[PDB]
Each structure stands twice: as C-alpha cells, then as structure tokens.
C-alpha cells in the first residue's frame, strides 16, 4: 500500500554477493590508494618530471579514497539494501551525488594533464625543462580540483528529498532522488558523459598514442634510464585510460536509461533489470577507484606485452615464419596493430607470407579487420597481386564487398593494378561488378583508366553477364 | 508499466 | 577630497585613440561575425565534417558578438573614460565579470574541440566517419557552453559593488570591484589562466601541430578536395591559436599584477602604468573577438606561406642555391622548422652547403635557433664535420658553449666524431674543455670513449694549457 | 604608495 511502488525486489543473493565486491574493492582500494597518498607524500624526487607526474598520481589516489570512504557506505546501505527511505537527509543526498561527479571531473582531468606532461617529456624535452615546474604544477592540480567542484555545483540543484508515498505523507517514502523535469536532468547527464568521459578520454587515447609512437621513432633513430621509465608511463597511463572507459561505460549507459527511456516503456520487467545493472555499473566504478595502484605495479608487465605485439608485427612483415609461431605460443596479442592500424595479418597479406597469414588466422586473427581508411587484409592481397593469400582470406569468412573511407572495394583494386587472375576469384565470390566509389568509378571504369584492356573486357562479360539474369 | 526508477 | 583616490590619470588623447580602436574594432567585429552567424544559419552542407565544423565556427562568432555588443560598451564607458562612480548596479557589476569569464572558456572549448574533430579526420577518417553525427556534435556545444557557465560562477562571488570613497557614504565612491581577499581572488584568476589559456591552448597546439605532419605523410604516401579543404583548416585554426595566445598573454599577465604585486610597490607610477596597460590589454581582447571572420578569409595566403617555409626547408637540405634566393626574395620565412624542430640553417650546417648557410645568415636566419633537443646548427656542424661552415657560424655569432637537454656542447659532438681541426677551432672561440654531460663525460672522455688517441692529446693540451693560467 | 587599482 504506502510505499509499495518504492520497493525494488533485487534477491538476497545479489545483495550479498554485490556487499561480498564492494568490501573486497573498499579493502583492495583503501590499501593500495592509501599506501600511494602515504609514500608519494614523504617522497622526494632530484628529476621535475618524477616529482610532478607523482603529484598527479596523488591527485587519483585522494579521488579514489573520497568514493570509497565516503560514497561506497552510503550507497551500499541506501541503495544496494534500504531502498527507502533516505537516511541522510537533504545536504547528505547533494553531498552524496555533488562528491560524486567532482570526483569524476578530477580523475579525467588529472589523467588528461599527466598525459600532456608525458607528450612534452617524449616530443618537446628542451622546451618541457624551462616551460614546465614544481610549484606551478601544483597550482594547475588545485586549479582542476576547483574546475571539478564547479562543473558538479548541477548536482546541488538537481538532486534532493522528495516524499513519493501516495500522498506524499508517509516518512517512509523519503527518497533522494532528481528534483528536475527529465528536459533539466538529461542536460546535466549529457554534460558529465561528455566532460568526465568522452571527450578528456578521447584526447587522453591521442596523446598517449602519439606519444608512444614518437617515443619509439626518437628511440629507434639518449638516456637509457629515461626511456625506460617513459615508456612505462605511456603504457601505465594506456591501461588507466581503457580501465577507465570500460568501468565507466556501463554507469553513462544506466543514466541515460534514466531520461531517455518514456514511462510506458517503463515495465516492472525493466526497473528490475535498471536495479540488476545498478549493481554491476556502480561496482565498475569502485573497481575504477582500486585498479590504478595494482596497474602501477604491472608496468614491466605491460611493457612484456607491448614488447611481444611489436615483436609479432615485425615477425608478420620480414617474414620469419617460426618467430611468429613462438610469440604466439606466448601469448602476444593477433590482433595487434601499428601507427596505421595494420594487424600482423595485414602486413603478411601485404608481403606475400602465404605460411604466416596461415598461421595467424589459425591463431583467430580477425580476418576482416580495418586499418584507418577502413582498409581489410583482402583490400591489400587484391592491391599488391597475391592469388594465393585471396583464396585463403575468402576461405576464412573474408567480406568480398568490404569498401574503405572512399567506397573502395577489392574489385577496384585488383581492377585498377592489373590483376586479371584476382579480378576473376573475387567475382567468383560474390564482388559486385559495378560498385561505385565516392566519385562513380566501376571496377571496369578503373580497368580502361590505366590501360588495362584485357580486365575492362572480363569484366564486361560479367557486366552483360548480369544482364542476362532478367 | 509507467514504474520509472527513482534511484539515479 | 571626497573622490580623488580613485581618479585614474589617463591623459584625454590616450582615451580618444582607444576610443577609435575600440570602435573601429566594434564595426569590423560585428561586421564579420554577424555575416559568419547569419551565413552558417542559413547554411545545409551534405559532408557531415563540414556541417560539423560550422556548428563550432557558429558558436565562435556567437561568443565575440556577446563579448562586442554587452562587454564593449560597459567598458568603454565605466572603465575607459567615466572610473567612478559605476552606473550599472549589482547585478550589471557580476553580469559583466561573469559574461567576459565565460565567453573565453567557451571560445577556449570550441577551439580544443575543432582541432579534435579535424584531427580525427586526418588520422581516424574511417572511425570518425562512424562515431561522428551531426546531433551529436550539437549536443557536445551545448555542453561546452554550460560548462563555460559553471566556470565562470566565481566572479558571480568574487566581483560586487563597493563605496570607496573617504567614508564609504559618497555617492562618486560606488565601483565595480573585487569583494574578496587577496588569496581568494588569486585563486579564481588562477583557473581562468589555466583553463581558458594555458591548458586548453596547450592542447590545440599539440593536436593542430600532429595532424598537419599526419596530413604531411599520408599525402606524400586520395581525395584531392579533402586535402586541400583540411590543409586549409588546420593553418586557419593555428592562426587561430597564435592569434589566441598573442591577444590575451597581456590580459592574464595584467590580471595576475592585480592580485601578486604588494600594497607598498603600488606606486602612483605603477598605478599609472597599469591603467595604461588595460587600455593595450583590453584592445587585444577586442582584437580577438575581431579577427577570425578575417582568418578565414586569409586561407589561400596562410597556405601559400606554408607552401613557401616547406619549399625552402627543401631548397636548404637539398642544395639548390638558386631556389632558396628566391623563396628568400618573395618573403618565405627563414626561421621556419620541420616536424624535428630543424630550420633551413640546422638543414644546411647538416648537409654542407656553405653557400646556402652565408645565404640564409645575411637574410637574418637565428643563428642559435634549436630544434626540440636543444641542438644548435653549430652542434649539428661539429657532429657531421664541416669546418667551414664552423667558422661561418661562429663568425656570425653561434654559442661555442651551447648545451642540448643531455648537457651536450659542441666540443663534446667534435672530439666524439673525430673531427680534430673542428675541436681546434672550437677550442680557441672559448669552448669550456672539461664541459659535463648528465653523465659526467667530458669532450675528454667522448674522444677515447671511441679510440680518437689524438683528439684526446689535443684535449689534454687544452686542460694542462687552463691549469698553466690560473 | 598603497594605492592599488579598484579596476580588475
Ligand atoms: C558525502 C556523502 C555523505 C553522506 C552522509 C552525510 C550525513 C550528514 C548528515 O548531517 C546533517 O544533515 C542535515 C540534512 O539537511 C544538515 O542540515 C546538517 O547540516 C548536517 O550536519
Ligand atoms: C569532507 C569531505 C572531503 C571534501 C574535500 C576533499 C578535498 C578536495 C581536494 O583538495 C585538493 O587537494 C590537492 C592536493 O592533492 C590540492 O592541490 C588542492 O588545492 C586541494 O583543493
Ligand atoms: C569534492 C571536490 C572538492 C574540491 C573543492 C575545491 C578545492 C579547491 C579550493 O582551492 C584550494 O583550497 C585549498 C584548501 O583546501 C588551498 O590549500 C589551495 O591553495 C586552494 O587552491
Ligand atoms: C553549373 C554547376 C552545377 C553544380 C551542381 C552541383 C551542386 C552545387 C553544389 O551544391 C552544394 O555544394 C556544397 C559543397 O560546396 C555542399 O556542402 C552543399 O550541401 C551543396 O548543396
Ligand atoms: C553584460 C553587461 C550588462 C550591463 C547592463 C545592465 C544594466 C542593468 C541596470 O538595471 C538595474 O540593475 C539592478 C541590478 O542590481 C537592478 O536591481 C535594478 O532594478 C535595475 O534598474
Ligand atoms: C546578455 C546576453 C544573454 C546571455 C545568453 C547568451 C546565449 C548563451 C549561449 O547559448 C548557447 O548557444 C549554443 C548555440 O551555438 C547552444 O549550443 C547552447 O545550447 C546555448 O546555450
Ligand atoms: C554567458 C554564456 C551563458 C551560457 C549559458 C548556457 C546554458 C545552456 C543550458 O543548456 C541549454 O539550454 C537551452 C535553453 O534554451 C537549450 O536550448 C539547450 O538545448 C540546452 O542544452
Ligand atoms: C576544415 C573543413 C573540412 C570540411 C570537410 C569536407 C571537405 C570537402 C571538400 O570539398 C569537396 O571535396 C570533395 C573531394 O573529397 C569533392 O568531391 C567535392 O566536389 C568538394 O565539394
């Protein structure tokens, strides 16, 4: 009767196994995240960069305790247990929900700031030892903790104490809950997913990417030490950074639920499986606030695999057929890819390496993956003029109508290079003999266009062949 | 239906 | 008497040639971001890239039209010409401060984000033409105006109205001030230099810099109006950046004198000066709210003069001395670099060409330009083993002591490579003989680290020839 | 002197 409506029905089960992942991840995460405050703070560093990515470092950790010191309890006692009614009252449900989205703001702009701090280290070392300091780095830090404060002051007004029992009487029905019409809350909902998560992670993925690569040119073209430590910081932040997106994704996913979702959609079906995916999204944020410190201690870890991937690509491309047995025997990851988005299987497709390209789709190499442009293993095989590599790749599950950024396809590819023998397997499986690029040119157009008659003639005959059908 | 969640 | 602490004492021409700047400033702004905003209104592109980047060009004008038509005024008439009292009350005191604070976060967001979105373009076209949408991109500046917002709440709190006169009663008194301490305010100017300058600036540069050498290598590795259109929109959006960072330097630099110089250096002399410096400072600002429709218009200019700096940087290393006179005679600019930090100078000392190097110097080529490790042309010199050009350098004015960012002088580079008469003439020019790296080496040490017996002979007649001084 | 602007 009273505040039937506000029960949620999640079994006993899931709250006990979800209570069982939240003290794990509160014990785990205070103890990893408490001993890096601890020891980062008595440290002192002789080299500026070492002491200005450890204040950072110390930025994370002090977001991290905030969540599961005080908003871990909270959360599992009023919305993992007692659903209603709120116990906190109304400056506890915005301290809750305001701590919160700060937090988020601080994580993502601290791992935003440490990766253009490595960027300059590796790209702009001379201009980095004069621009960059101690002091002024700290400044920047209280700077983002005030930017955090600022963009999560929407959640002191759209969050608070609302009594939804049927007559708005009953003390039970005492809920913290959105006090804003869906139009105001889906504005602020937008404004985190972007600014806590789209768009610092997407610029924090460039950074660290371009970082990573320069660092291996100027390697491969200096101070061994700094190298070193460099390129486990590149690949520490890299793990942070797809840590944090994965843990993250789930909870945007759920709030969006929230407001985009129309009542009538609304099912009993469906707010029992919201309550299920609130257990599962908001344990991956308290997971997000214990896994940094154990990513700091793979680091050599990370730099293994990194060191095998890389290993693989060169094994694929010079063509050391065994190399690439052992690495993957290992475990170094298939699917792979380098500065321009080619797998191993797209640089022995490109270099002939009919044995590797075996060996890697054996392996489960993702027969049908892009490079940049969109470019497929098939794409390349077609363009450089190897037979053999087609077949195998078309035998595997490769899309023959694969098309990259400008409408490309193989057919216009083993058309326009003056692969007869090519042009005649892919039509053979299933190539679309008049696909148009971009700009309206046929695989046929692209024959006749550098000369190659004898192609333009095969592929009329598969023209008219099609005529025919009708 | 028209149950929505309360619980952000 | 009453009112005579607040007088400024500007002299009357000083305010009529602001005047006519911030007038003439007024007319062009309007002018061209009016015709900007009404032409991308009425605008329907079919390349979702292109609708996407008017979408932010759309917002830019948005934000200097608030800035000219509100801001302009106020200030002409409560800060350049009438000082006391104010005479728009409380409410126009915080909206003015909060107003200007939030249109350069916005314009400062806008920009980060258009050299993300044209980066992906370039080095993610395939993925970009997928995980981009129209909506989406609204959605996002929506965001970024909201966010400014939120950014821009503490001068809500920090600026008020105050009475200043002798006995806080008089009328004539009544300003627009800060209502803060000191340190309260030097944290609020603090957030604005950082995150409506420094950082977001920091950035667009980063990823404005990469995609112009990604579009580089991926051309010289198509769609030929692609290229040229992003060409065109990577040199805009970094004349863009320059024009940003040259307009507001003074701005932030006023800002911080306001809240870091003492009550007992506040001279009358200083007073004077800094009322001065605002009238510079804010023109600047005025400048920047002006000068993008402009910009846009200077497209096919800014890529001729990057075609020009590109063709002598080639002209300089490939040795064609003709070619570098004329580029030289059409105005292509000499202190030019590559993707190394390398200028046409650093390019001809690598590969010889003495002439070119006399040419380049005489035209007023930075004799001690560095690339991004610090390295002199004079380093570059010594290490390949070119004497002529040593002395051709040295001559015009080259630092003998020069240290790249490993500690690294020119004497070191000429005694590791075996270049005994480059160590000679280093030598007699004032090269420090026991100079150290990081690493403790000396010139010394590098020439039989690699078995050059007799440039460490030499040596050691240059250290035993210091100790017979002193 | 101690007399600083009123002017931000
Ligand atoms: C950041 C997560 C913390 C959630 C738990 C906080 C409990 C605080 C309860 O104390 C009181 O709550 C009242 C409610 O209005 C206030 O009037 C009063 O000032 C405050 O002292
Ligand atoms: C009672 C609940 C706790 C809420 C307040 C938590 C502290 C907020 C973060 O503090 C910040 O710490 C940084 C050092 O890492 C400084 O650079 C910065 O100036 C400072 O602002
Ligand atoms: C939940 C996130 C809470 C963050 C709240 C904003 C904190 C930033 C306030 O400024 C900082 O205050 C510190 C004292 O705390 C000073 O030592 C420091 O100099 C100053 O810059
Ligand atoms: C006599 C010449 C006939 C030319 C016919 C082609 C159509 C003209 C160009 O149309 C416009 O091109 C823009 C690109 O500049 C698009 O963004 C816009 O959406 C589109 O409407
Ligand atoms: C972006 C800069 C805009 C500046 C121009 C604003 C002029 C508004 C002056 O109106 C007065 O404002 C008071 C504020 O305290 C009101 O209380 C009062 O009723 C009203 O008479
Ligand atoms: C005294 C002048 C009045 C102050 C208010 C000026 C308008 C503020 C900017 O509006 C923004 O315009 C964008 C379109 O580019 C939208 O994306 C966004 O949703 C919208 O919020
Ligand atoms: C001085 C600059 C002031 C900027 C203030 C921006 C606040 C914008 C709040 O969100 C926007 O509100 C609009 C209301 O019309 C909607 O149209 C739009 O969809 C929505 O996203
Ligand atoms: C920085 C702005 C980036 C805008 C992105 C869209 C680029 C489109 C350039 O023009 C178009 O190029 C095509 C070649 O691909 C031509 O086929 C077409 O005729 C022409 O209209």
Same mark, same amino acid.
Do not use: E, L, Y
């Given at each position: 009767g009273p505040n039937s409506d506000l029960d949620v029905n999640t079994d006993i089960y899931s709250k006990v196994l979800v209570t069982a992942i939240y003290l794990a991840l509160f014990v785990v995460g205070t103890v990893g995240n408490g001993v890096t405050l601890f020891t980062l703070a008595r440290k002192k560093s002789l080299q500026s960069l070492q002491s200005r990515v450890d204040y950072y470092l110390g930025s994370l950790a002090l977001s991290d305790l905030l969540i599961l010191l005080f908003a871990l309890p909270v959360d599992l006692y009023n919305?993992?247990?007692?659903?209603?009614?709120?116990?906190?009252?109304d400056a506890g449900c915005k301290g809750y929900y305001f701590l919160r989205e700060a937090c988020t703001y601080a994580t993502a702009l601290n791992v935003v700031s440490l990766s253009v701090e490595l960027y300059l280290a590796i790209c702009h070392p001379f201009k980095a030892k004069t621009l960059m300091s101690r002091s002024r780095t700290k400044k920047f830090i209280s700077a983002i903790w005030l930017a955090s404060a600022l963009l999560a002051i929407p959640m002191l007004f759209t969050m608070g104490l609302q009594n939804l029992s049927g007559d708005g009487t009953?003390?039970?029905?005492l809920v913290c809950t959105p006090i804003v019409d869906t139009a105001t809350l889906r504005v602020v909902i937008q404004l985190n997913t972007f600014m806590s998560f789209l768009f610092p992670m997407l610029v924090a993925s460039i950074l660290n990417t371009v970082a990573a690569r320069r660092l291996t040119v100027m390697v491969h073209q200096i101070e061994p030490g700094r190298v070193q430590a460099l390129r486990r910081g590149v690949l520490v932040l890299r793990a942070v950074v797809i840590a944090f997106v994965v843990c993250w994704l789930p909870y945007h996913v759920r709030r969006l639920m929230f407001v985009y979702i129309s009542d009538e959609q609304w099912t009993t079906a469906l707010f029992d499986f919201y309550h299920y995916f609130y257990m599962l999204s908001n344990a991956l944020v308290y997971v997000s606030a214990a896994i940094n410190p154990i990513l700091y201690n793979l680091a050599e870890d990370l730099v293994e695999d990194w060191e095998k991937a890389r290993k693989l690509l060169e094994a694929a491309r010079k063509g050391q057929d065994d190399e690439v047995r052992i690495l993957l025997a290992n475990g +170094? &990851? !298939?699917n792979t890819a380098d500065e321009t988005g080619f797998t191993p299987l797209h640089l022995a497709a490109w270099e002939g390496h009919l044995g590797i390209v075996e060996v890697l789709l054996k392996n489960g190499?993702?027969?049908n993956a892009n490079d940049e442009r969109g470019h497929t293993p098939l794409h390349l095989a077609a363009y450089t003029g190897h037979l053999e590599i087609v077949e195998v790749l078309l035998k595997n599950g490769?899309?023959?109508?694969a098309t990259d950024?400008?409408?490309?396809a193989p057919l216009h590819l083993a058309a326009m290079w003056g692969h007869l023998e090519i042009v005649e397997v892919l039509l053979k499986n299933g +190539? &679309? !003999?008049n696909a148009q690029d971009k700009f309206g040119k046929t695989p046929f157009d692209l024959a006749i266009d550098n000369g190659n008659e004898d192609i333009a003639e095969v592929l009329q005959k598969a023209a008219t062949r099609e005529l025919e059908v009708l | 239906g028209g149950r929505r969640p309360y619980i952000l």
């Open positions: 919305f993992i247990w007692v659903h209603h009614p709120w116990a906190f009252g009953h003390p039970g029905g +170094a &990851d !298939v190499a993702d027969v490769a899309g023959v109508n950024v400008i409408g490309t +190539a &679309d !003999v | -």
